[PDB]
Amino acid sequence: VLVQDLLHPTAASEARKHKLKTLVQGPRSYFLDVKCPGCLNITTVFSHAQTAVTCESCSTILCTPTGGKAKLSEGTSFRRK
Amino acid sequence: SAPQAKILSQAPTELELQVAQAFVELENSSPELKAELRPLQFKSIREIDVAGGKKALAIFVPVPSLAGFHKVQTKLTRELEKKFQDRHVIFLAERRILPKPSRTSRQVQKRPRSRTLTAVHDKILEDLVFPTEIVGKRVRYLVGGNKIQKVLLDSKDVQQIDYKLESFQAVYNKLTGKQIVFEIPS
Amino acid sequence: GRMHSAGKGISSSAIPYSRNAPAWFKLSSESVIEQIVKYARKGLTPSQIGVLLRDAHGVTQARVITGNKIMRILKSNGLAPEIPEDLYYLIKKAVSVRKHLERNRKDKDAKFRLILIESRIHRLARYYRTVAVLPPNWKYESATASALVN
Amino acid sequence: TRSSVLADALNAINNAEKTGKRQVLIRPSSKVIIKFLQVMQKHGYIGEFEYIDDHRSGKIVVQLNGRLNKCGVISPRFNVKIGDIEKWTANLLPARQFGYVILTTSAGIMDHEEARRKHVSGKILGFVY
Amino acid sequence: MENDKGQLVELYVPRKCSATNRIIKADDHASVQINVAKVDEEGRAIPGEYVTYALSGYVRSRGESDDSLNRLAQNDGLLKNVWSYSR
RNA sequence: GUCCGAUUUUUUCGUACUGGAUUUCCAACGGGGCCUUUCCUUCUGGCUAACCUUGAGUCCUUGUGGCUCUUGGCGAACCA
Numbered sequence: 074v075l076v077q078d079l080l081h082p083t084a085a086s087e088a089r090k091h092k093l094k095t096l097v098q099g100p101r102s103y104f105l106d107v108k109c110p111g112c113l114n115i116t117t118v119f120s121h122a123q124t125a126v127t128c129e130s131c132s133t134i135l136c137t138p139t140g141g142k143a144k145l146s147e148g149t150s151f152r153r154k
Numbered sequence: 155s156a157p158q159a160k161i162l163s164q165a166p167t168e169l170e171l172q173v174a175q176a177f178v179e180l181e182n183s184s185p186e187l188k189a190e191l192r193p194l195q196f197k198s199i200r201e202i203d204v205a206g207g208k209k210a211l212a213i214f215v216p217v218p219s220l221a222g223f224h225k226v227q228t229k230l231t232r233e234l235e236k237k238f239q240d241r242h243v244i245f246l247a248e249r250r251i252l253p254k255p256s257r258t259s260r261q262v263q264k265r266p267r268s269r270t271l272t273a274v275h276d277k278i279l280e281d282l283v284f285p286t287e288i289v290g291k292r293v294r295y296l297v298g299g300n301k302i303q304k305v306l307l308d309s310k311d312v313q314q315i316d317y318k319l320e321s322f323q324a325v326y327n328k329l330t331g332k333q334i335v336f337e338i339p340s
Numbered sequence: 341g342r343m344h345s346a347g348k349g350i351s352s353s354a355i356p357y358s359r360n361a362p363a364w365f366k367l368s369s370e371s372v373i374e375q376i377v378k379y380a381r382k383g384l385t386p387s388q389i390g391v392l393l394r395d396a397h398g399v400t401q402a403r404v405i406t407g408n409k410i411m412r413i414l415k416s417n418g419l420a421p422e423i424p425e426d427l428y429y430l431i432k433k434a435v436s437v438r439k440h441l442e443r444n445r446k447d448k449d450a451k452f453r454l455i456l457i458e459s460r461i462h463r464l465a466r467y468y469r470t471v472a473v474l475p476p477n478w479k480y481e482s483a484t485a486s487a488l489v490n
Numbered sequence: 491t492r493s494s495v496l497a498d499a500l501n502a503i504n505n506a507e508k509t510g511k512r513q514v515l516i517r518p519s520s521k522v523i524i525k526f527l528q529v530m531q532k533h534g535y536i537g538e539f540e541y542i543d544d545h546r547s548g549k550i551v552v553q554l555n556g557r558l559n560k561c562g563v564i565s566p567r568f569n570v571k572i573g574d575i576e577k578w579t580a581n582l583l584p585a586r587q588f589g590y591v592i593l594t595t596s597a598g599i600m601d602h603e604e605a606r607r608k609h610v611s612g613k614i615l616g617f618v619y
Numbered sequence: 620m621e622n623d624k625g626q627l628v629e630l631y632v633p634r635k636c637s638a639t640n641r642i643i644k645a646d647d648h649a650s651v652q653i654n655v656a657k658v659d660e661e662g663r664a665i666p667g668e669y670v671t672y673a674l675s676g677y678v679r680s681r682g683e684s685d686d687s688l689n690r691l692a693q694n695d696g697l698l699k700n701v702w703s704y705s706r
Numbered sequence: 707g708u709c710c711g712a713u714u715u716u717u718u719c720g721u722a723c724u725g726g727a728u729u730u731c732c733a734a735c736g737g738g739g740c741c742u743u744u745c746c747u748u749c750u751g752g753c754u755a756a757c758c759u760u761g762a763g764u765c766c767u768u769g770u771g772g773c774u775c776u777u778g779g780c781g782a783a784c785c786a
């Protein structure tokens with residue numbers, strides 16, 4: 074208060090702000106590489122996917138959509154990038 | 155018809171030809187270095203003094219070419235620096251700049267945004283570091299009146315320019331007239 | 341704030357400081373384009389195209405990774421629609437509301453909402469007329485509206 | 491909807507001064523702002539200021555050094571003939587001995603002292619004291 | 620304030636607060652003047668000699684009179700690790 | 707340098723007026739030009755290259771039209 078480093082906010086406070094209200098606005102979302110423990114297909118998704126994403130075939134289901142972060146369907150793997 | 159005086163446009167000068175045979179050197183490595191290196195010639199080089207006891211090499215590539223030079227930029231810059239001690243190597247695609255149109259200096263047919271002073275100067279900097287993108291800039295208006303543009307380079311693979319960083323500044327300053335300062339994430 | 345509501349929401353996207361990137365993509369513009377057109381020929385709108393590409397195909401944006409925004413591509417490929425997607429969905433909407441009015445005739449709120457929606461449609465089409473993407477006359481007609489959404 | 495941008499800039503500064511702060515945030519960042527900020531720094535009513543590159547229109551962090559009383563905008567940017575600068579300075583400046591009324595002339599943006607010298611005029615941007 | 624022949628007119632030149640550079644009014648009776656002791660070779664507080672800040676009424680009333688005062692001490696050395704620019 | 711009331715009030719002590727070009731002796735300021743990819747756009751004048759062109763001449767580990775001079779066309783660039 075009164076005198077502070079506006080050009081250099083902390084990190085733990087910059088991560089507390091709203092998506093648009095940081096020093097330069099940036100997305101809080103990511104991407105997951107997701108497969109099921111049966112198949113060998115590296116199907117990459119979005120954190121907040123709005124579509125019931127599947128593997129290229131096998132009529133499987135990777136995620137169900139919601140009001141925010143998508144819901145990875147049951148037993149499935151994921152690395153974040 | 156020619157392996158040496160061919161791999162470059164317009165005749166002067168010597169340092170170029172010196173570099174040219176450094177290019178044909180790698181060209182003796184058929185499947186890879188001889189592959190995507192014969193299409194890649196360059197226009198001109200300007201030598202510039204740096205802060206230390208060396209100098210940097212501004213190789214002015216054209217523009218449609220700049221794509222391929224980038225694909226070899228990793229390897230080639232390094233091999234160039236092996237065959238050149240006391241020289242930092244940077245590739246700078248020369249871009250055309252058009253004047254801001256005026257009641258005097260008028261030209262019909264608009265004027266693309268890419269032929270813009272501030273837009274080209276903006277690319278010079280992108281190339282003047284090639285790998286590692288930028289995550290932010292600032293510009294400091296010093297309490298006496300002068301800009302100092304702070305560039306914020308990625309943490310990923312900065313190793314390829316961590317040292318050139320001190321030299322990049324003098325390059326930019328020579329070309330434009332504006333002073334740079336670099337920096338890193340925290 | 342809102343144009344027709346009295347709402348003051350800020351819920352938007354947030355495009356990253358990254359006109360290039362991503363370092364993990366690896367797929368080349370030329371490829372992703374041929375997937376956009378693949379979907380656009382399967383009858384899909386730019387909005388809901390980049391929704392699939394953002395989701396299942398890990399392509400973050402289209403202006404990056406291809407240098408061109410989605411609709412601009414469709415037009416080049418002659419998969420440009422008749423009237424724009426906004427205008428369209430507005431006109432579709434206004435249609436359905438009116439179709440509700442035609443049986444439920446005491447729905448005074450319905451009538452109110454139509455007056456809002458059709459204000460929007462005209463405001464839009466006005467602009468679209470202004471920048472040559474609709475013919476000088478055009479204008480949204482109610483009686484003929486159901487036709488224009490097929 | 492935003493209208494002047496050079497209004498909300500000067501106001502934030504003005505506001506931040508009054509409440510004892512020595513730094514402000516200025517969104518968005520118009521060139522007219524900066525040139526104004528330049529004129530406003532040339533006589534040290536503000537200190538260092540730094541542009542922030544959003545991929546958009548900008549932000550600015552200006553450092554404040556007290557001694558600012560009011561940095562104002564005048565809207566609409568009226569037409570000022572040369573012998574009318576005399577009149578605005580009369581009206582909206584504290585004393586004959588200081589303060590500034592920065593303009594927009596074809597010869598760039600500048601304080602009224604300067605325009606007085608180069609013998610130029612145009613619209614009025616605002617004032618500082 | 621000068622004059623005709625440079626001679627220093629104007630009755631008196633007022634203090635300026637040390638957190639906002641703002642003039643301390645002759646009736647600003649919430650304006651405060653702190654006097655901190657300089658200490659010679661270990662322990663012993665040097666009498667007569669002070670490190671001195673001045674804090675105006677407005678800063679104090681708004682309760683900024685501690686944080687601001689703290690920055691001031693740490694930056695004339697009198698503090699280590701208490702105030703912290705970036706927050 | 708001298709008009710002029712010359713001021714705390716002692717003697718060889720200090721309060722509006724004029725002269726000033728160039729010193730590198732600091733400062734401020736203002737007019738006009740250039741260079742840095744930047745006099746563009748129209749037109750006209752100048753100086754002409756290159757360019758095919760007629761005619762006489764050579765060279766070629768190849769008709770290669772390369773080089774020269776020669777006839778009259780056509781005027782990039784450039785300067786104003």
Ligand SMILES: [Mg+2]
Binds near residue numbers: 341348
């Ligand atoms: Mg709002």
Ligand SMILES: [Mg+2]
Binds near residue numbers: 343344
């Ligand atoms: Mg309204």
Ligand SMILES: [Zn+2]
Binds near residue numbers: 107
């Ligand atoms: Zn699977």
